[PDB]
Amino acid sequence: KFPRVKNWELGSITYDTLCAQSQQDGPCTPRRCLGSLVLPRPAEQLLSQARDFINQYYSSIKRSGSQAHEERLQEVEAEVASTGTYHLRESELVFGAKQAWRNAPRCVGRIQWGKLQVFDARDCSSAQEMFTYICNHIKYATNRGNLRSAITVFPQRAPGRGDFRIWNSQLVRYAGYRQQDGSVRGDPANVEITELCIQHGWTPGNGRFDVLPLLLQAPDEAPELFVLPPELVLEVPLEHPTLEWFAALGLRWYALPAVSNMLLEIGGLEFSAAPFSGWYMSTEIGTRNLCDPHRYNILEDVAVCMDLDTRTTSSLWKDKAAVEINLAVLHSFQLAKVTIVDHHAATVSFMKHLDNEQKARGGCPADWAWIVPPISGSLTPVFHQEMVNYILSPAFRYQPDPW
Amino acid sequence: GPKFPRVKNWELGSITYDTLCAQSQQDGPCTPRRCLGSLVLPRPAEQLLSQARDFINQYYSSIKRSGSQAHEERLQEVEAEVASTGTYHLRESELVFGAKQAWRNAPRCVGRIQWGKLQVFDARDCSSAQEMFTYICNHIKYATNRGNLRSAITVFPQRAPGRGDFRIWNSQLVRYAGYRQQDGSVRGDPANVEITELCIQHGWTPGNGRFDVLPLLLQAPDEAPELFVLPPELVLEVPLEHPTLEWFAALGLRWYALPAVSNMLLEIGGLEFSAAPFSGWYMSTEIGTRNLCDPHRYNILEDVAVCMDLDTRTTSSLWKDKAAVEINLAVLHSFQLAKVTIVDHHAATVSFMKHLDNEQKARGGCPADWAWIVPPISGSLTPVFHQEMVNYILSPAFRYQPDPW
Ligand code: HEM
Ligand code: HEM
Ligand SMILES: Cc1cc(N)nc(CCCCCO[C@H]2CNC[C@H]2Cc2cc(C)cc(N)n2)c1
Ligand SMILES: Cc1cc(N)nc(CCCCCO[C@H]2CNC[C@H]2Cc2cc(C)cc(N)n2)c1
Ligand SMILES: C[C@H](O)[C@H](O)[C@H]1CNC2=NC(N)=NC(=O)C2=N1
Ligand SMILES: C[C@H](O)[C@H](O)[C@H]1CNC2=NC(N)=NC(=O)C2=N1
Ligand SMILES: [Zn+2]
């Protein structure tokens, strides 16, 4: 039965028919819903995924049933039957990468999905060459603050051998130095990767915002360490439009959000290294990165500085400090002329995206818990919107850590 | 290791496994193909007996008498009663247990740390609309307790074969009128437009304010509903002021003290209680964020922002966030000053975390609807945002039911 999907603010209703196109199970069953969980719980198979994807591609260019379409299916079929695998043409890769983003249920920025620079790095044969491609990506995507969405696709997994992998979870990560007294200096999210870096020969610093080097891995080789050139890593000092002492906090964040640990799956083929980047929504930095108790955890420091009544929850000191921190992020990025979007503008765009996709494809997979921002949830339109979550391919997926 | 859902807390790094979900006898809306967890309304013969037996087993387990002679005798009693009459009836102590369990089982309620403290008024003798009203007034008086609020439920007679239901037509015991205007807008609470118009159709003379308390429309078996005005002195309200913004008081906003849901069905051992209103106390975000700030509710965000002199022309000033915070603070401050029980969303969610731990030990899990548990402002500032949750239907349960009209 195709789900009825309701918007409770507007009273409008849609039916999701796109979900019938899902060929991949999620974690929920009729007995229990596991929608809030962060992590998920032969040749004929490759052949049907490949054919389905080639069909998707030729349909997108309006060329279903054409000579080119029939001949491409034969090529794919021939290659799989002989070798157990196949290869994508660059145009198919570009279409596949955009579709993977379009299909990502946890992404509120999908209004932008058709605007993605795709770097084909499948001719990469060494960690050294990976570093070169990553530097070109960062340079292109950063664009002096006028951020442009981009993906670089390194060579696919092959049955015979180890994967190409970028060990770091993002291309830009701040060190987290664990103390002998358990506590952390820097970003506690990055304790493990920091220690892997030191262990692979990196000389650590001792600051709160030390940019990590990249550990890059070519198949069946020890990862290699590469320091990013400082001028490639654009950063924004954080200050507040009216609170003078805020800048004295010595806070900063990086411009470029680039996820580097996810697997890109297109037509059954798997790209274990395919880092992608857009621009930040302010709550990612202002709310999560800076205010999570297990991240930089600055709420109390800011509250004290604001002279708020910390003695009690009902003064709403946490809520007040968080708002000001989010404002400082927005102010500071605007001042530095670095692309950023606030959570109201981003969720308004997502509502438009939902409407675009309803008309174009008859639905849109969306993970409500991820779409709704971590402050002011019900003040955004997406809170009042019912959403259907399911897996379509092409897809970005999680994968095991390479160590 | 375990073949039960693994549940992680990402703030603390701690892991549990929910084994309680094995006890679910009712399907929700999700399938392996697609998750429908965000939907608001998720899409008897020997059937009664097996539900009845399961509930009786639950009762005797809770008093540690499973397998006992008293347990086996009650089972026989129930099947005998069903055998001859088609239905059965609960002992008083069974109703009390069943009502607390239904609250304990409610995935959408963040206040469940309180589940063991519920005053259960047994109104299964009620035989008229007038008597329903007396019971409800008594419930309201007891629950409100001059501002020192106490959780209560009043249970009216169960649904019976081929006989009409007891129903309360209003969705809550206290509701503000919503009057549709000529221009298409609403004065009062747009949530209550339909029930307002139904009160008018049934003979209520409407006011014209923003906070007019509605009458109750009460229905006894196979009769037209009857209209009852709540004595104004029974309905405690709190005028809203702000601790530092002196003009906020001039806005004339207010809310009532007692949150009392009256349109849900209480199901216990297959028996169905179609009128069983229950009340607690408010979490401040229900009033200050949803009721006052929803675009389709009182919608006051812009008015407050304008008074605070914020830049309302651009999303990036965070004018909405700043105004909502102050409205929420006004709610807490005003209830505190008025000595009326209220709980903020930080304190509520902290206590729900304690509840989750209690239930892990007591029952091996706790059904919880993440979208409902996470507060509508400051989500990730609260510990529940970082907590994975497993949602499933246990019985006894509170359920939605069709509107009487
Ligand atoms: C255009 C700028 C973009 C904005 C404002 C945006 C917005 C977001 C936000 C707010 C999240 C949640 C992040 C978190 O909570 O940590 C997210 C996640 C995601 N986004 Fe987008 N996004 C953008 C570009 C992209 C691009 C270019 C791709 C792929 C090519 C993408 C794919 C994803 C994926 C796969 C996730 C989930 C990541 C994970 O699960 O760890 N995003 N995005
Ligand atoms: C003791 C103080 C209590 C607090 C602070 C509390 C808190 C809450 C909150 C914040 C919600 C979400 C409501 C919304 O978003 O509109 C809720 C829903 C719910 N609560 Fe509790 N609660 C309390 C007592 C109770 C009692 C006594 C019962 C039943 C005996 C109960 C059963 C429920 C049910 C069934 C829902 C879902 C309502 C619906 O789906 O319409 N609560 N409660
Ligand atoms: C493209 C893009 C745009 C934008 N605005 N922001 C980003 C950054 C997304 C960062 C997401 C990282 O998620 C981690 C940390 N919190 C939840 C967790 C989920 C997860 C788990 C795993 C194993 C991998 C992964 N990528 N993500 C990327
Ligand atoms: C006991 C209690 C404590 C407390 N703090 N707050 C309350 C009030 C809960 C009111 C819940 C109302 O929910 C309505 C309005 N928004 C979603 C919708 C869900 C719903 C639908 C239907 C058909 C019935 C119903 N009871 N609830 C009750
Ligand atoms: C347990 C819960 O699912 C996690 O805390 C989720 C909640 N929602 C979330 N939403 C987003 N956008 N990013 C997150 O990391 C995130 N964490
Ligand atoms: C579409 C979405 O499920 C609704 O807007 C939900 C989200 N979470 C919610 N949570 C709570 N506590 N009450 C709600 O009314 C509510 N509405
Ligand atoms: Zn689900």
Rg for chain A, CA atoms, rounded? 23
* Maximum distance among all Cα pairs of chain A, rounded to whole angstroms: 74
CATH superfamily to which B18-124+151-161+265-279+349-373 belongs: Nitric Oxide Synthase; Chain A, domain 1 (3.90.340.10)
Percentage helix, strand, coil, to 5, in chain A? 40, 15, 45
Contact A247, A239 (CB under 8 A): yes
Residue A370 near ligand 5, beta carbon < 6 Å:
yes
Among candidate residues A284, A288, A305, A361, the one labeled active-site is A284
Q: Write the residues followed by a gap in chain A (C–N more than 2.5 A).
A: 41
What does the DSSP 8-state code read for residue A116?
A: -
Q: CA B128: distance to chain centroid?
A: 25
Among candidate residues A101, A167, A279, A317, the one labeled active-site is A279
Cα A154–Cα A158–Cα A162 angle in degrees, nearest 5? 80
Pairing of strands A214-217, B271-273: unpaired
Dig out the tokens for B115 from the structure.
């589940």
Question: Distance between CA atoms of A269 and A133, rounded to whole angstroms?
Answer: 21
Peptide bond into B231 cis (omega under 30): no
- CATH class of the domain defined by B125-150+165-236+400-404: alpha beta
Contact A351, A110 (CB under 8 A): no
Residue A295, chain B, CB below 8 Å: the answer is no
Amino acid at A134: I
Question: Distance between CA atoms of B172 and B176, rounded to whole angstroms?
Answer: 10
**What technique was this entry resolved by?**
X-ray
Nearest Cα to Cα of residue A118 among A305, A346, A274:
A274
Contact A355, A162 (CB under 8 A): no
Question: Distance between CA atoms of B234 and B145, rounded to whole angstroms?
Answer: 10
Q: Which ligand is nearest to the CA of B347?
A: 2
Q: Helix (H, G, I), strand (E, B), or coil: what is residue B110?
A: coil
Known catalytic residue at A279: yes
Residue A42: exposure state from Cβ atoms within 10 A (0-12, 13-18, ≥19): exposed
Nearest Cα to Cα of residue B305 among B337, B315, A381, B378:
B315
- Spatial CB neighbours of B30, under 8 Å, sequence gap ≥ 6: A28, A29, A30, A32, A33, A35, B36, B37
Q: Which ligand is nearest to the CA of B172?
A: 4
Dihedral, B255, B257, B258, B263 alpha carbons, nearest 10? 0
Question: Distance between CA atoms of A320 and A308, rounded to whole angstroms?
Answer: 9
Nearest Cα to Cα of residue B284 among A313, A385, A8:
A313
Torsional sign, CA B374, B375, B377, B382: negative
Nearest Cα to Cα of residue A384 among A353, A347, A346:
A347
Q: Tell me which chain B residues have a C-beta less than 8 angstroms from the C-beta of A376.
A: 320-321, 324, 377-378
Residue A342, chain B, CB below 8 Å: the answer is yes
Q: Helix (H, G, I), strand (E, B), or coil: what is residue B149?
A: coil
Chain B from 236 to 255: CB within 8 A of any A CB: none
Distance from CA of B340 to the nearest CA of A (A): 14
Q: What are the beta bridge partners of residue A253? A: A236
Q: Helix (H, G, I), strand (E, B), or coil: what is residue B388?
A: coil
Residue written as token pair 């693994």: B6
Residue B28: exposure state from Cβ atoms within 10 A (0-12, 13-18, ≥19): buried
Name which of B38, B336, B392 is nearest A386 (Cβ-Cβ). B38
Residue with CA at minimum distance from ligand 6 atom 3: B38
Is the backbone of residue B275 left (phi > 0), alpha (psi -120 to 50) or beta? beta
Residue with CA at minimum distance from ligand 4 atom 19: B40
Nearest 5°: phi and psi at A220? Answer: 60, 25
Contact: B316, A330; criterion CB under 8 Å? yes
User: B15-22 — which CB contacts under 8 Å span 24+ positions?
Assistant: B16/B360, B16/B365, B17/B364, B17/B365, B18/A32, B18/B364, B18/B365, B18/B366, B18/B390, B19/B364, B19/B365, B20/B359, B20/B363, B20/B364, B20/B365, B20/B366, B20/B367, B20/B394, B21/A31, B21/A32, B21/B365, B21/B367, B21/B390, B21/B392
Q: According to the annotation, is A125 in a ligand binding site?
A: no
Amino acid at A398: Y
Question: Distance between CA atoms of B139 and B122, rounded to whole angstroms?
Answer: 11
Residue B386 near ligand 5, beta carbon < 6 Å:
yes
Which residues have any ligand 3 atom within 6 Å of their CB? Answer: A 38, 257, 259, 261-262, 276-278, 280-281, 284, 398
Residue B4, chain A, CB below 8 Å: the answer is no
Task: Report resolution (Å) to 1 decimal.
Answer: 2.0
Dig out the tokens for A76 from the structure.
């794919």
Contact B353, B382 (CB under 8 A): no
Question: Distance between CA atoms of A192 and B125, rounded to whole angstroms?
Answer: 65
Q: Helix (H, G, I), strand (E, B), or coil: what is residue A259?
A: strand
Chain A from 157 to 216: CB within 8 A of any B CB: none
Residue with CA at minimum distance from ligand 1 atom 19: A107
Contact: B33, A25; criterion CB under 8 Å? yes
Nearest Cα to Cα of residue B255 among B346, B158, B327, B168:
B327
Residue B373, chain A, CB below 8 Å: the answer is no
Q: CA A250: distance to chain centroid?
A: 27
Contact: B378, A319; criterion CB under 8 Å? yes
Q: What are the beta bridge partners of residue A117? A: A150
Contact A144, A338 (CB under 8 A): no
Residues in chain A: 403
Residue B8 CA: nearest ligand 5 atom is 1
Residue B182: exposure state from Cβ atoms within 10 A (0-12, 13-18, ≥19): exposed
> Tell me, which fold does domain B237-259+282-347 have in CATH?
3.90.1230
Element (H, E) at B256: strand B254-256
Torsional sign, CA B92, B93, B95, B99: positive
Residue written as token pair 């002011």: A376
Nearest Cα to Cα of residue B16 among B363, B395, B394, B369:
B363
Element (H, E) at A106: none
Contact: A8, B296; criterion CB under 8 Å? yes
Q: Helix (H, G, I), strand (E, B), or coil: what is residue A336?
A: coil
Q: Helix (H, G, I), strand (E, B), or coil: what is residue A174?
A: strand
How far is residue B162 from each of residues A347, B222, B343, measured CA to CA in Å? Answer: 50, 10, 43
Nearest 5°: phi and psi at A178? Answer: -75, 135
Helices B319-337 and A317-335, axial angle in degrees (round to 10) = 170
Question: Distance between CA atoms of A174 and A191, rounded to whole angstroms?
Answer: 9
Q: CA A289: distance to chain centroid?
A: 15
| Cβ-count burial B226-245 (b if 16+ within 10 Å, e if not) | bbbebeeebebbbebbbeeb
Dig out the tokens for A307 from the structure.
């002279």
Rg for chain B, CA atoms, rounded? 23
Contact A134, A171 (CB under 8 A): yes
For residue A334, how many other CB atoms are within 10 A of its CB?
A: 14
- What residue ranges do the domains of chain B occupy? 18-124+151-161+265-279+349-373, 125-150+165-236+400-404, 237-259+282-347
Contact A15, A4 (CB under 8 A): yes
Contact: B6, A36; criterion CB under 8 Å? no
- The CATH code for residues A16-122+149-159+263-277+347-371 is 3.90.340.10
Question: Distance between CA atoms of B175 and B178, rounded to whole angstroms?
Answer: 9
- CATH class of the domain defined by A235-257+280-345: alpha beta
Q: Which ligand is nearest to the CA of B371?
A: 6
Residue B41 near ligand 6, beta carbon < 6 Å:
no
What does the DSSP 8-state code read for residue A38?
A: S
For residue B296, how many other CB atoms are within 10 A of its CB?
A: 13
Instruction: Say yes or no: do domains A16-122+149-159+263-277+347-371 and A235-257+280-345 share a fold.
Output: no
Among candidate residues A72, A102, A110, A157, the one labeled active-site is A110
Question: Distance between CA atoms of B232 and B237, rounded to whole angstroms?
Answer: 10
Q: Does domain A123-148+163-234+398-402 have CATH number 3.40.50.720?
A: no
Residue B390 near ligand 2, beta carbon < 6 Å:
no
Nearest Cα to Cα of residue B384 among B397, B371, B365, B396:
B371
Q: Could you list the active site residues of B?
A: 109, 112, 281, 286
How far is residue A130 from each of residues A169, A190, A213, A223, B153, measured CA to CA in Å? Answer: 15, 22, 13, 11, 66
Percentage helix, strand, coil, to 5, in chain B? 40, 15, 45
- Spatial CB neighbours of B352, under 8 Å, sequence gap ≥ 6: B110, B111, B112, B113, B373, B384
What does the DSSP 8-state code read for residue B289?
A: I
Contact B42, A32 (CB under 8 A): no
Contact: B392, A31; criterion CB under 8 Å? yes
Pairing of strands B282-283, B342-343: parallel
Nearest Cα to Cα of residue B326 among B349, B303, B342:
B303
> What is the full DSSP assignment across B312-375?
TT-GGG-HHHHHHHHHHHHHHHHHHHTT--EE-HHHHHHHHHHHHHHHHHHHS--B--HHHHS-
Nearest 5°: phi and psi at A97? Answer: -65, -45
Contact A260, A166 (CB under 8 A): yes
Dig out the tokens for B207 from the structure.
């006011």
> What is the full DSSP assignment across A180-238?
TTS-EEE-GGGHHHHHHHHHTT-----SSSPBPPEEEE-TTS--EEEPPPGGGS-EEE-
Q: Could you tell me which residues of B are annotated as the binding site for L-arginine?
A: 172, 281-282, 286, 291
Contact: A379, B301; criterion CB under 8 Å? yes
Nearest Cα to Cα of residue B168 among B141, B143, B123, B133:
B133
Peptide bond into A394 cis (omega under 30): yes
